[PDB]
mmCIF file of all heavy atoms in Angstrom:
data_model
loop_
_atom_site.group_PDB
_atom_site.id
_atom_site.type_symbol
_atom_site.label_atom_id
_atom_site.label_comp_id
_atom_site.label_asym_id
_atom_site.label_seq_id
_atom_site.Cartn_x
_atom_site.Cartn_y
_atom_site.Cartn_z
ATOM 1 N N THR A 37 125.521 11.778 20.780
ATOM 2 C CA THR A 37 126.979 11.746 21.278
ATOM 3 C C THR A 37 127.741 12.759 20.380
ATOM 4 O O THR A 37 127.563 12.783 19.148
ATOM 5 C CB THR A 37 127.424 10.343 20.992
ATOM 6 O OG1 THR A 37 126.697 9.469 21.898
ATOM 7 C CG2 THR A 37 128.987 10.219 21.123
ATOM 8 N N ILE A 38 128.457 13.697 21.064
ATOM 9 C CA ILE A 38 129.120 14.698 20.324
ATOM 10 C C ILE A 38 130.568 14.870 20.824
ATOM 11 O O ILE A 38 130.766 14.865 22.117
ATOM 12 C CB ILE A 38 128.391 16.106 20.634
ATOM 13 C CG1 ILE A 38 126.841 15.913 20.448
ATOM 14 C CG2 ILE A 38 129.072 17.207 19.690
ATOM 15 C CD1 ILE A 38 126.144 17.296 20.712
ATOM 16 N N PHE A 39 131.550 15.029 19.970
ATOM 17 C CA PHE A 39 132.870 15.249 20.250
ATOM 18 C C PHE A 39 133.425 16.417 19.324
ATOM 19 O O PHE A 39 133.075 16.625 18.199
ATOM 20 C CB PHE A 39 133.776 14.010 19.670
ATOM 21 C CG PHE A 39 133.641 12.946 20.713
ATOM 22 C CD1 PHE A 39 132.641 11.993 20.547
ATOM 23 C CD2 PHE A 39 134.547 12.825 21.704
ATOM 24 C CE1 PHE A 39 132.493 10.980 21.453
ATOM 25 C CE2 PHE A 39 134.337 11.742 22.697
ATOM 26 C CZ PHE A 39 133.343 10.840 22.587
ATOM 27 N N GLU A 40 134.368 17.162 20.058
ATOM 28 C CA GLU A 40 135.135 18.245 19.355
ATOM 29 C C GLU A 40 136.482 17.557 19.042
ATOM 30 O O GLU A 40 136.939 16.719 19.651
ATOM 31 C CB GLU A 40 135.292 19.404 20.264
ATOM 32 C CG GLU A 40 136.025 20.520 19.513
ATOM 33 C CD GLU A 40 136.275 21.767 20.267
ATOM 34 O OE1 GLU A 40 136.486 21.728 21.503
ATOM 35 O OE2 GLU A 40 136.365 22.907 19.549
ATOM 36 N N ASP A 41 137.113 18.146 17.983
ATOM 37 C CA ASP A 41 138.562 17.816 17.698
ATOM 38 C C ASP A 41 138.852 16.391 17.473
ATOM 39 O O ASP A 41 139.826 15.825 18.131
ATOM 40 C CB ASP A 41 139.439 18.368 18.777
ATOM 41 C CG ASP A 41 139.305 19.776 18.929
ATOM 42 O OD1 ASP A 41 139.301 20.567 17.865
ATOM 43 O OD2 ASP A 41 139.214 20.149 20.094
ATOM 44 N N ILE A 42 137.922 15.660 16.644
ATOM 45 C CA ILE A 42 138.288 14.417 16.203
ATOM 46 C C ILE A 42 138.044 14.503 14.721
ATOM 47 O O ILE A 42 137.330 15.354 14.140
ATOM 48 C CB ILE A 42 137.534 13.311 16.857
ATOM 49 C CG1 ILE A 42 135.968 13.396 16.472
ATOM 50 C CG2 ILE A 42 137.745 13.088 18.285
ATOM 51 C CD1 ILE A 42 135.153 12.232 16.819
ATOM 52 N N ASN A 43 138.852 13.627 14.065
ATOM 53 C CA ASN A 43 138.542 13.485 12.697
ATOM 54 C C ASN A 43 138.177 12.141 12.238
ATOM 55 O O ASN A 43 138.736 11.176 12.750
ATOM 56 C CB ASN A 43 139.543 14.178 11.719
ATOM 57 C CG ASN A 43 140.817 13.181 11.532
ATOM 58 O OD1 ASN A 43 141.318 12.823 12.462
ATOM 59 N ND2 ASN A 43 141.031 12.737 10.293
ATOM 60 N N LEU A 44 137.170 12.026 11.482
ATOM 61 C CA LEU A 44 136.466 10.852 11.023
ATOM 62 C C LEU A 44 136.459 10.803 9.563
ATOM 63 O O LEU A 44 136.333 11.769 8.835
ATOM 64 C CB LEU A 44 135.079 10.778 11.623
ATOM 65 C CG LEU A 44 134.978 10.729 13.140
ATOM 66 C CD1 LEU A 44 133.570 10.701 13.578
ATOM 67 C CD2 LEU A 44 135.621 9.417 13.626
ATOM 68 N N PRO A 45 136.585 9.649 8.996
ATOM 69 C CA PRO A 45 136.570 9.472 7.512
ATOM 70 C C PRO A 45 135.293 9.363 6.882
ATOM 71 O O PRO A 45 134.281 9.127 7.604
ATOM 72 C CB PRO A 45 137.391 8.116 7.386
ATOM 73 C CG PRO A 45 136.864 7.296 8.495
ATOM 74 C CD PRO A 45 136.730 8.317 9.715
ATOM 75 N N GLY A 46 135.290 9.648 5.672
ATOM 76 C CA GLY A 46 134.065 9.414 4.852
ATOM 77 C C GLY A 46 133.023 10.483 4.806
ATOM 78 O O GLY A 46 133.268 11.620 5.231
ATOM 79 N N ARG A 47 131.932 10.182 4.281
ATOM 80 C CA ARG A 47 130.785 11.108 4.058
ATOM 81 C C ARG A 47 130.090 11.420 5.361
ATOM 82 O O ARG A 47 130.202 10.690 6.452
ATOM 83 C CB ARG A 47 129.878 10.717 2.835
ATOM 84 C CG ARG A 47 130.606 10.655 1.527
ATOM 85 C CD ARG A 47 131.042 12.032 1.037
ATOM 86 N NE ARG A 47 131.265 13.249 1.799
ATOM 87 C CZ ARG A 47 130.384 13.978 2.521
ATOM 88 N NH1 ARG A 47 129.045 13.625 2.762
ATOM 89 N NH2 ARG A 47 130.876 15.051 3.159
ATOM 90 N N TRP A 48 129.530 12.645 5.425
ATOM 91 C CA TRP A 48 128.851 13.151 6.565
ATOM 92 C C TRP A 48 127.654 13.967 6.113
ATOM 93 O O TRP A 48 127.623 14.342 4.954
ATOM 94 C CB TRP A 48 129.792 13.860 7.479
ATOM 95 C CG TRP A 48 130.553 15.000 6.856
ATOM 96 C CD1 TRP A 48 131.764 14.831 6.190
ATOM 97 C CD2 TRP A 48 130.189 16.355 6.731
ATOM 98 N NE1 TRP A 48 132.210 16.019 5.812
ATOM 99 C CE2 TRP A 48 131.271 16.942 5.963
ATOM 100 C CE3 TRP A 48 129.119 17.036 7.050
ATOM 101 C CZ2 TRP A 48 131.332 18.330 5.686
ATOM 102 C CZ3 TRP A 48 129.135 18.452 6.704
ATOM 103 C CH2 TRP A 48 130.088 19.054 5.974
ATOM 104 N N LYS A 49 126.745 14.325 7.086
ATOM 105 C CA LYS A 49 125.602 15.201 6.670
ATOM 106 C C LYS A 49 125.653 16.365 7.721
ATOM 107 O O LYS A 49 125.874 16.142 8.855
ATOM 108 C CB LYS A 49 124.348 14.400 6.647
ATOM 109 C CG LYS A 49 124.184 13.467 5.531
ATOM 110 C CD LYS A 49 122.827 13.041 5.135
ATOM 111 C CE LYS A 49 122.664 12.166 3.939
ATOM 112 N NZ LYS A 49 121.322 11.997 3.514
ATOM 113 N N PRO A 50 125.387 17.634 7.269
ATOM 114 C CA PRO A 50 125.269 18.803 8.142
ATOM 115 C C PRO A 50 124.112 18.610 9.089
ATOM 116 O O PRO A 50 123.022 18.049 8.730
ATOM 117 C CB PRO A 50 124.971 20.007 7.221
ATOM 118 C CG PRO A 50 124.414 19.427 5.863
ATOM 119 C CD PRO A 50 125.058 17.944 5.802
ATOM 120 N N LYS A 51 124.288 18.918 10.322
ATOM 121 C CA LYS A 51 123.140 19.141 11.177
ATOM 122 C C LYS A 51 123.429 20.528 11.884
ATOM 123 O O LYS A 51 124.686 20.978 11.921
ATOM 124 C CB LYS A 51 122.943 17.926 12.204
ATOM 125 C CG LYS A 51 122.442 16.653 11.433
ATOM 126 C CD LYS A 51 120.930 16.684 11.148
ATOM 127 C CE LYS A 51 120.194 15.285 11.296
ATOM 128 N NZ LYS A 51 120.683 14.463 12.422
ATOM 129 N N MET A 52 122.459 21.193 12.324
ATOM 130 C CA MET A 52 122.556 22.182 13.423
ATOM 131 C C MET A 52 121.832 21.604 14.653
ATOM 132 O O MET A 52 120.664 21.123 14.442
ATOM 133 C CB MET A 52 121.981 23.560 13.043
ATOM 134 C CG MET A 52 122.863 24.229 11.902
ATOM 135 S SD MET A 52 122.176 25.778 11.323
ATOM 136 C CE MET A 52 122.432 25.683 9.532
ATOM 137 N N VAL A 53 122.437 21.742 15.860
ATOM 138 C CA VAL A 53 121.855 21.113 17.100
ATOM 139 C C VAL A 53 121.735 22.101 18.350
ATOM 140 O O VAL A 53 122.510 22.995 18.365
ATOM 141 C CB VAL A 53 122.460 19.790 17.428
ATOM 142 C CG1 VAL A 53 122.409 18.716 16.330
ATOM 143 C CG2 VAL A 53 123.892 19.960 17.984
ATOM 144 N N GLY A 54 120.675 21.976 19.307
ATOM 145 C CA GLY A 54 120.419 23.071 20.254
ATOM 146 C C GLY A 54 120.726 22.623 21.646
ATOM 147 O O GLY A 54 120.427 21.469 22.041
ATOM 148 N N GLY A 55 121.119 23.652 22.422
ATOM 149 C CA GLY A 55 121.439 23.428 23.779
ATOM 150 C C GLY A 55 120.923 24.653 24.552
ATOM 151 O O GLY A 55 120.159 25.441 23.999
ATOM 152 N N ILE A 56 121.514 24.616 25.731
ATOM 153 C CA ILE A 56 121.432 25.838 26.575
ATOM 154 C C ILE A 56 122.266 26.892 25.970
ATOM 155 O O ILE A 56 123.419 26.665 25.582
ATOM 156 C CB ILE A 56 121.706 25.599 28.038
ATOM 157 C CG1 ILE A 56 120.512 25.517 28.928
ATOM 158 C CG2 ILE A 56 122.476 26.763 28.527
ATOM 159 C CD1 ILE A 56 120.933 25.514 30.369
ATOM 160 N N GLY A 57 121.653 28.155 25.736
ATOM 161 C CA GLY A 57 122.265 29.192 25.060
ATOM 162 C C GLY A 57 122.285 29.345 23.595
ATOM 163 O O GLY A 57 122.665 30.315 23.041
ATOM 164 N N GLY A 58 121.895 28.280 22.820
ATOM 165 C CA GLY A 58 121.908 28.407 21.440
ATOM 166 C C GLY A 58 122.105 27.125 20.712
ATOM 167 O O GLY A 58 121.921 26.106 21.336
ATOM 168 N N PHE A 59 122.787 27.185 19.595
ATOM 169 C CA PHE A 59 122.807 26.021 18.866
ATOM 170 C C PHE A 59 124.386 25.830 18.452
ATOM 171 O O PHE A 59 125.202 26.708 18.519
ATOM 172 C CB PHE A 59 122.246 26.217 17.417
ATOM 173 C CG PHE A 59 122.832 27.372 16.646
ATOM 174 C CD1 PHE A 59 123.923 27.072 15.834
ATOM 175 C CD2 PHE A 59 122.382 28.687 16.703
ATOM 176 C CE1 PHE A 59 124.448 28.067 15.017
ATOM 177 C CE2 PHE A 59 122.930 29.609 15.902
ATOM 178 C CZ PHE A 59 123.972 29.412 15.125
ATOM 179 N N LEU A 60 124.794 24.648 18.044
ATOM 180 C CA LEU A 60 126.044 24.084 17.589
ATOM 181 C C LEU A 60 125.976 23.577 16.208
ATOM 182 O O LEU A 60 125.066 22.647 16.003
ATOM 183 C CB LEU A 60 126.605 23.073 18.633
ATOM 184 C CG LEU A 60 127.928 22.482 18.320
ATOM 185 C CD1 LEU A 60 129.055 23.531 18.580
ATOM 186 C CD2 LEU A 60 128.112 21.203 19.178
ATOM 187 N N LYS A 61 126.809 23.955 15.319
ATOM 188 C CA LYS A 61 126.850 23.449 13.924
ATOM 189 C C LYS A 61 127.818 22.203 14.077
ATOM 190 O O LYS A 61 128.888 22.261 14.625
ATOM 191 C CB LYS A 61 127.663 24.370 13.021
ATOM 192 C CG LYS A 61 127.680 23.955 11.567
ATOM 193 C CD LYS A 61 128.211 25.066 10.574
ATOM 194 C CE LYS A 61 129.631 25.435 10.683
ATOM 195 N NZ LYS A 61 130.561 24.526 9.871
ATOM 196 N N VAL A 62 127.277 21.049 13.550
ATOM 197 C CA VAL A 62 128.200 19.802 13.555
ATOM 198 C C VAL A 62 128.001 19.028 12.189
ATOM 199 O O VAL A 62 127.214 19.348 11.367
ATOM 200 C CB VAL A 62 127.523 18.783 14.706
ATOM 201 C CG1 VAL A 62 127.599 19.461 16.117
ATOM 202 C CG2 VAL A 62 126.083 18.418 14.307
ATOM 203 N N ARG A 63 128.954 18.087 12.148
ATOM 204 C CA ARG A 63 128.912 17.030 11.104
ATOM 205 C C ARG A 63 128.472 15.768 11.641
ATOM 206 O O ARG A 63 128.991 15.384 12.709
ATOM 207 C CB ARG A 63 130.316 16.803 10.551
ATOM 208 C CG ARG A 63 131.026 17.976 9.823
ATOM 209 C CD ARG A 63 132.374 17.445 9.368
ATOM 210 N NE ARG A 63 133.069 18.435 8.534
ATOM 211 C CZ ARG A 63 134.143 18.366 7.909
ATOM 212 N NH1 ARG A 63 134.661 17.037 7.965
ATOM 213 N NH2 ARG A 63 134.745 19.311 7.284
ATOM 214 N N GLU A 64 127.498 15.054 11.025
ATOM 215 C CA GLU A 64 126.947 13.779 11.546
ATOM 216 C C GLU A 64 127.654 12.643 10.706
ATOM 217 O O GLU A 64 127.495 12.551 9.529
ATOM 218 C CB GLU A 64 125.431 13.694 11.379
ATOM 219 C CG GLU A 64 124.850 12.411 11.899
ATOM 220 C CD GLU A 64 123.408 12.137 11.908
ATOM 221 O OE1 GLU A 64 122.663 12.636 12.798
ATOM 222 O OE2 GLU A 64 123.039 11.328 11.097
ATOM 223 N N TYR A 65 128.297 11.780 11.460
ATOM 224 C CA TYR A 65 128.865 10.583 10.825
ATOM 225 C C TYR A 65 128.144 9.357 11.354
ATOM 226 O O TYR A 65 127.836 9.259 12.533
ATOM 227 C CB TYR A 65 130.401 10.490 11.373
ATOM 228 C CG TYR A 65 131.257 11.468 10.657
ATOM 229 C CD1 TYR A 65 131.447 12.754 11.194
ATOM 230 C CD2 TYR A 65 131.908 11.125 9.402
ATOM 231 C CE1 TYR A 65 132.333 13.673 10.588
ATOM 232 C CE2 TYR A 65 132.753 12.120 8.845
ATOM 233 C CZ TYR A 65 132.911 13.348 9.449
ATOM 234 O OH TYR A 65 133.879 14.129 8.813
ATOM 235 N N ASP A 66 127.851 8.432 10.526
ATOM 236 C CA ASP A 66 127.063 7.173 10.852
ATOM 237 C C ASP A 66 128.116 6.093 10.990
ATOM 238 O O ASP A 66 129.222 5.958 10.245
ATOM 239 C CB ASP A 66 126.052 6.812 9.795
ATOM 240 C CG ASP A 66 124.979 7.826 9.546
ATOM 241 O OD1 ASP A 66 124.719 8.659 10.585
ATOM 242 O OD2 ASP A 66 124.450 7.782 8.469
ATOM 243 N N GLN A 67 127.684 4.998 11.784
ATOM 244 C CA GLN A 67 128.503 3.802 11.839
ATOM 245 C C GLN A 67 129.952 3.993 12.150
ATOM 246 O O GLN A 67 130.845 3.445 11.711
ATOM 247 C CB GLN A 67 128.477 3.104 10.456
ATOM 248 C CG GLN A 67 127.300 2.094 10.316
ATOM 249 C CD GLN A 67 127.529 1.156 9.210
ATOM 250 O OE1 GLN A 67 128.542 0.563 9.177
ATOM 251 N NE2 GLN A 67 126.562 0.985 8.337
ATOM 252 N N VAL A 68 130.235 4.831 13.291
ATOM 253 C CA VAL A 68 131.510 5.162 13.871
ATOM 254 C C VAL A 68 131.788 4.232 14.945
ATOM 255 O O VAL A 68 130.921 4.051 15.911
ATOM 256 C CB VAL A 68 131.434 6.608 14.452
ATOM 257 C CG1 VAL A 68 132.856 6.986 14.919
ATOM 258 C CG2 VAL A 68 130.957 7.551 13.259
ATOM 259 N N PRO A 69 133.014 3.715 15.133
ATOM 260 C CA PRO A 69 133.364 2.842 16.219
ATOM 261 C C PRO A 69 133.611 3.579 17.546
ATOM 262 O O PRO A 69 134.335 4.607 17.485
ATOM 263 C CB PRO A 69 134.642 2.129 15.874
ATOM 264 C CG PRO A 69 135.327 3.062 14.904
ATOM 265 C CD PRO A 69 134.146 3.650 14.184
ATOM 266 N N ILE A 70 132.971 3.152 18.596
ATOM 267 C CA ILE A 70 133.126 3.787 19.917
ATOM 268 C C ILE A 70 133.471 2.626 20.837
ATOM 269 O O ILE A 70 132.673 1.584 20.865
ATOM 270 C CB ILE A 70 131.923 4.460 20.357
ATOM 271 C CG1 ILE A 70 131.288 5.366 19.241
ATOM 272 C CG2 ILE A 70 132.197 5.292 21.635
ATOM 273 C CD1 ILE A 70 129.852 5.916 19.452
ATOM 274 N N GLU A 71 134.582 2.630 21.522
ATOM 275 C CA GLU A 71 134.799 1.731 22.605
ATOM 276 C C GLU A 71 134.605 2.508 23.877
ATOM 277 O O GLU A 71 135.215 3.577 24.161
ATOM 278 C CB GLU A 71 136.350 1.374 22.595
ATOM 279 C CG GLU A 71 136.571 0.565 21.286
ATOM 280 C CD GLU A 71 138.039 0.059 21.155
ATOM 281 O OE1 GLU A 71 138.777 0.204 22.062
ATOM 282 O OE2 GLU A 71 138.370 -0.398 20.002
ATOM 283 N N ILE A 72 133.740 1.899 24.717
ATOM 284 C CA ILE A 72 133.327 2.567 25.907
ATOM 285 C C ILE A 72 132.890 1.419 26.941
ATOM 286 O O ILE A 72 132.182 0.559 26.636
ATOM 287 C CB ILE A 72 132.032 3.490 25.596
ATOM 288 C CG1 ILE A 72 131.482 4.090 26.894
ATOM 289 C CG2 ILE A 72 130.915 2.750 24.731
ATOM 290 C CD1 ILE A 72 130.514 5.240 26.668
ATOM 291 N N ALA A 73 133.460 1.607 28.129
ATOM 292 C CA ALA A 73 132.953 0.818 29.332
ATOM 293 C C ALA A 73 133.158 -0.648 29.022
ATOM 294 O O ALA A 73 132.316 -1.565 29.409
ATOM 295 C CB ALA A 73 131.690 1.182 29.769
#
């Protein structure tokens, strides 16, 4: 699950991740609240 333009608190770890056309640099946050459906 990936979002742009959100800010989340606390520690994170760098990942780089791959799609069609190349890769995206992201920050990985654990134990984030998601309300969905």
Side-chain angles (χ1 to χ4, degrees):
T37 294
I38 315 179
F39 283 87
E40 187 182 28
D41 297 320
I42 61 168
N43 77 303
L44 293 178
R47 301 289 26 295
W48 51 273
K49 296 199 175 191
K51 288 283 211 40
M52 291 173 223
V53 301
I56 255 191
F59 65 85
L60 178 73
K61 185 167 74 81
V62 298
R63 295 184 177 186
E64 181 177 282
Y65 288 89
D66 298 337
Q67 270 201 50
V68 182
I70 314 167
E71 300 184 3
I72 175 164

